[PDB]
């Protein structure tokens with residue numbers, strides 16, 4: 001198909017923004033240990049919102065690109081409107097870069113004045129630091145997007161992949177509305193914040209992720225669409241079974257009932273299952289191939305994505321989802337260790353997987369690059385993937401020691417927040433190295449084009 | 450074990466748990482007035498939330514352990530700095546001496562806040578510590 005080349009810009013700008021993300025990571029990573037680094041010009045909290053808002057934004061660009069690519073093929077017909085796909089891109093990309101520059105060029109309390117938050121207060125919540133106007137912009141785009149690729153599935157084949165992907169995307173945009181509801185009651189606020197973050201990342205995004213993985217496994221392994229789509233539905237079912245009540249693992253210590261401690265801890269124990277399925281799903285279909293596929297990197301990406309997501313989301317997720325454990329780790333470097341692997345392994349890698357598949361056949365190079373670009377992608381893969389297992393190790397170390405010094409002792413023996421942070425400094429430097437190796441591996445990956 | 454069977458486990462079993470969730474929230478949202486102490490939630494506590502929101506304190510700090518891991522937990526900073534009687538006066542001084550500027554130490558910005566703004570902040574943070582947060586944190590330090 002020929003309208004699939006509107007997915008190309010989405011994929012590039014995603015990778016552009018992905019480089020912005022890692023830099024600001026590296027700054028913050030250093031501010032941990034050189035406390036007044038770039039102060040007062042760029043305070044830690046500004047670097048952090050740029051770091052995390054680039055992540056959330058470059059993953060959407062990455063998800064949209066994938067839909068603009070793979071929905072034509074699945075629907076067996078051209079995209080409803082390539083005009084729209086380009087008009088939205090620039091709006092979204094303008095909207096993104098402005099919002100980021102807002103964080104960077106004006107004091108946040110000022111930006112709240114400038115954009116007039118008083119009328120409709122939604123600013124100042126983790127991941128949702130963007131001005132209300134900017135949120136509105138994101139919804140407009142996300143509506144234009146949904147519509148455009150939504151129509152394409154109607155006027156064409158209705159494969160399971162295409163359907164589930166539409167569910168995930170519709171659901172993504174709906175839940176994002178709760179970013180507008182901003183309760184006066186703090187505990188009410190927190191309750192409904194996790195409808196954005198958790199039902200995204202552990203519910204609705206798992207449909208997006210699963211669907212792309214399954215779409216990729218059909219094309220590189222040549223296995224029967226009918227067993228792939230079966231397996232897909234299993235993984236999804238297991239995701240929404242565990243994950244919807246499993247939300248309760250975020251509802252332990254925020255001022256809601258204690259019955260969530262049982263419900264959250266019981267249902268969260270099940271949330272690594274979908275991820276365990278994902279690796280069996282990758283490994284089997286990739287192992288019973290009717291095909292040796294010319295792009296050897298995709299197979300590595302698909303297998304790695306599923307493993308890394310299992311380790312980050314699943315294993316690291318389980319390790320501290322049990323209220324008894326979570327009590328001592330809640331809001332610790334351990335939480336940061338998990339978040340990093342779970343975000344990277346699941347969603348950063350799956351965007352890179354489908355890019356690794358579609359990019360050559362968006363530049364009309366072929367199904368694969370030459371052997372130069374291929375051993376580079378794979379170098380990048382490993383540098384990044386291995387860089388991040390260290391990042392999570394180093395921070396897991398911090399978190400464990402931190403629980404030890406600050407959290408477990410009783411009043412008086414408990415060492416101070418800012419005092420324990422001084423013990424953790426070595427780990428934080430090691431992490432900056434891991435972070436540098438990561439940037440290298442991202443640059444390796446990037447040179448492969 | 451066909452593709453029709455797996456597709457229905459997803460369809461039915463999710464509609465079940467959405468309801469169960471929504472039913473579970475409905476209850477929970479009735480217990481909130483009592484667990485959060487909404488009586489004590491004055492327009493000060495509320496204006497204080499907005500100061501908190503407007504200067505992105507959560508981008509360095511945690512509040513009931515949710516936020517950023519750069520600076521201390523603040524859901525319980527009251528009991529650590531002067532308690533309920535002396536906390537406000539503390540925050541007053543604390544907010545206007547930033548940045549401490551001790552070299553190579555993690556910085557906090559000057560937020561140019563009015564004493565009325567800093568007071569609501571304190572009221573917001575006090576009301577927050579008195580939320581039934583199922584005995585979290587372990588200890589005084591956050």
Ligand code: HEC
Pocket residue numbers: 043044045046418500501504505506507508509510519520521523526529530540543549554555556557558560570
């Ligand atoms: C609203 C915008 C904010 C409020 C209210 C508070 N902060 Fe901060 N903060 C930061 C650091 C690095 C420290 C430790 C200072 C040191 O020991 O050198 C603090 C400390 C506090 C405290 C004292 C807490 C305690 O138990 O000692 C309070 C009460 C407090 N902060 C309130 C850093 C930052 C920061 C980094 C860019 C931001 C944006 C804020 N703080 C914002 C707020």
Ligand code: HEM
Pocket residue numbers: 126201202249250268269271272309312313314316317318320321322326329330331335338339340342343346347514515516
């Ligand atoms: C790809 C999937 C996942 C992603 C991207 C992810 C991401 C995150 C992030 C970013 C946070 C902290 C956010 C904050 O407080 O600002 C978090 C918290 C947490 N996650 Fe996940 N997660 C995933 C899956 C899971 C799994 C499947 C489980 C359970 C097995 C798990 C267990 C937890 C727990 C217990 C916390 C609470 C830590 C705390 O107490 O703050 N996560 N997750």
Ligand code: HEM
Pocket residue numbers: 022024025026027028029048051052055335336339340342343344345348431432434435436438439516517518519520
């Ligand atoms: C590679 C170098 C990186 C560095 C040096 C870095 C550094 C940081 C720092 C310092 C924070 C804030 C910690 C705090 O809140 O106190 C953070 C947050 C975060 N980063 Fe990164 N980061 C890096 C890469 C990544 C990558 C590759 C991802 C990909 C998924 C990612 C996802 C996140 C997420 C989700 C948070 C919010 C975590 C939470 O609240 O638990 N980061 N990062």
Ligand SMILES: CCCCCCCCCCS[C@@H]1O[C@H](CO)[C@@H](O[C@H]2O[C@H](CO)[C@@H](O)[C@H](O)[C@H]2O)[C@H](O)[C@H]1O
Pocket residue numbers: 261262265266322323324327583584585586587588
């Ligand atoms: C598979 C396991 C599923 C279990 C689900 C139900 C879990 C409920 C258990 C209580 S959660 C939490 O546990 C805490 C003990 O670690 C309990 O802490 C107790 O001791 C603390 C010192 O160790 C002390 O600071 C507290 O004041 C004291 O109450 C805490 O109350 C409780 O909410």
Ligand SMILES: [Ca+2]
Pocket residue numbers: 126515516517518
């Ligand atoms: Ca956080």
Ligand SMILES: [Fe+3]
Pocket residue numbers: 198202246247249250
């Ligand atoms: Fe979760």
Ligand SMILES: [O]
Pocket residue numbers: 198202
């Ligand atoms: O999570």
